[PDB]
Design a protein that fits this description.
Number of helices: 12
Oligomer: monomer
Bound molecules: 2'-deoxyguanosine-5'-triphosphate, calcium ion
Number of domains: 4
Subunit structure: Monomer. Interacts with the PCNA heterotrimer via PCNA1.
Number of strands: 12
Keywords: Cytoplasm, DNA damage, DNA repair, DNA replication, DNA-binding, DNA-directed DNA polymerase, Magnesium, Metal-binding, Mutator protein, Nucleotidyltransferase, Transferase
Order of helices and strands: EHEEHHEHEEHEHEHHHHEHEEHE
Radius of gyration: 22 Å
Catalytic activity: DNA(n) + a 2'-deoxyribonucleoside 5'-triphosphate = DNA(n+1) + diphosphate
EC number: 2.7.7.7
Strand content: 15-25%
CATH architecture of the largest domain: 2-Layer Sandwich
Distance between the termini: 33 Å
Subcellular location: Cytoplasm
DNA sequence: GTTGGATGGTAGA
DNA sequence: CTAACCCTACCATCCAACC
């Protein structure tokens, strides 16, 4: 079993660089402009030049400009990056129809039947990087291993523009030596819970009673970690099927007023109902980010498919339900459809 | 017991 | 308006309806 994983380098900003090659070699910051004030919103991503100075995904545009005023600030153009991504995913598909598109910028290929061994896998890696460079001028990192988890880890170790194999031997070694916080799926909350226990390595999860582990981090994560430590992990590459599709938007200002909020919710419903594209949902959820950034939602599952009209009607109800039960003002409002027929 | 719906938490893009 | 956007996957918990 051999998995090749592809993850595009500083994606949104690299696309902008390809579109406008004069930007290459200099700082580039792609931004989500909330419209609340002069330069409100967050950085979606930045090129390596900008990251040198602490500008990265997630920080507020004004914070980025405080540390890099001279940089080039471009507004996120999601549709453009999705079109470049699709062209890339289809090139990848020529290397293996057995492909799992995991996100806007990354994909797992099962290549067990394209290559005999890791050295051939590595070579196909080199070919992939070249095709994507010839055809779309986008550099990418490649990670190759026996499974998804370690292929992802491998690419994390190779960024940017890299290529890493983690073979059966180094998987053994990493199980013993890799900080467990570097395992995909282990964020801040879990990592702090593991350290309290004294679990620092995947191998540690084997020297602890299951129920005390499951008691601290939940069953599923614990099962997953043990699986990895035993080297018995093997979740197959599967064709991506979207389980939910939604839209969320930021308001010019915070409100509790239904009439002040409706235009945003309706903007988001229209945009959502359009991304559905022949998919028919049975559940709708109205999602509200509050004053203090706490996320709050109200939903309904119907026994049947929701028409756009039903969606209009029910979301307004749901929104009112939020207002009725949470006494805080709202700052972002959206809607998410799920349970496709 | 099982299934699944409502709602929130965690993670990562 | 004074910093914090966008989108999706998965799981846990507290439930109720089932039989
Ligand atoms: N709006 C928004 N978009 C994000 C965020 N994080 C990532 N993205 C988008 C923009 C990125 O270019 C794209 C891929 O994200 P990645 O995590 O892979 O990092 P990126 O590709 O930018 O460079 P990376 O591989 O480190 O070199 O997804 C975020 O917090 N907000
Ligand atoms: Ca990525
Ligand atoms: Ca990337
Ligand atoms: Ca981590």
């Amino acid at each position: 079993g051999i998995v090749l994983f592809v993850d595009f380098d500083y994606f949104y900003a690299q696309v902008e660089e390809v579109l406008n090659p004069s930007l290459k070699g200099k700082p580039v910051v792609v931004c989500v402009f909330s419209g609340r004030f002069e330069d409100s919103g967050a950085v979606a991503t930045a090129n390596y030049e900008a990251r040198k100075f602490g500008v990265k995904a997630g920080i507020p545009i004004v914070e980025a400009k405080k540390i890099l005023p001279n940089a080039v600030y471009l507004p996120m153009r999601k549709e453009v990056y999705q079109q470049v991504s699709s062209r890339i995913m289809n090139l990848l598909r020529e290397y293996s129809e057995k492909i799992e598109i995991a996100s806007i910028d990354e994909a797992y290929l099962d290549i067990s039947d394209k290559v005999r061994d890791y050295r051939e896998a590595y070579n196909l890696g080199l070919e992939i990087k070249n095709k994507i460079l010839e055809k779309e001028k986008i550099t990418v990192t490649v990670g190759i291993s026996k499974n998804k988890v370690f292929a992802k880890i491998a690419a994390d170790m190779a960024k940017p523009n890299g290529i890493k194999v983690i073979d059966d031997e180094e998987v053994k070694r990493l199980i013993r030596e890799l900080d467990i916080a570097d395992v995909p799926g282990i964020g801040n909350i879990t990592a702090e819970k593991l350290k309290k226990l004294g679990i620092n390595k995947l191998v540690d999860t084997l020297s602890i009673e299951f129920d005390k582990l499951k008691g601290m981090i939940g069953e599923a994560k614990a099962k997953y970690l043990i699986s990895l430590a035993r080297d018995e992990y093997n979740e197959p590459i599967r064709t991506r099927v979207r389980k939910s599709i939604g839209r969320i938007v930021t308001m010019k200002r915070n409100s509790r007023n239904l009439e002040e909020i409706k235009p945003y919710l309706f903007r988001a419903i229209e945009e959502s109902y359009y991304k559905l594209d022949k998919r028919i949902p049975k559940a709708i959820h109205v999602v509200a980010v509050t004053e203090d950034l706490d996320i709050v939602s109200r939903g309904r599952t119907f026994p049947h498919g929701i028409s756009k009209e039903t969606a209009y009607s029910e979301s307004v109800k749901l929104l009112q339900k939020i207002l009725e039960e949470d006494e805080r003002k709202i700052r972002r409002i959206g809607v998410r459809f799920s349970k496709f027929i």
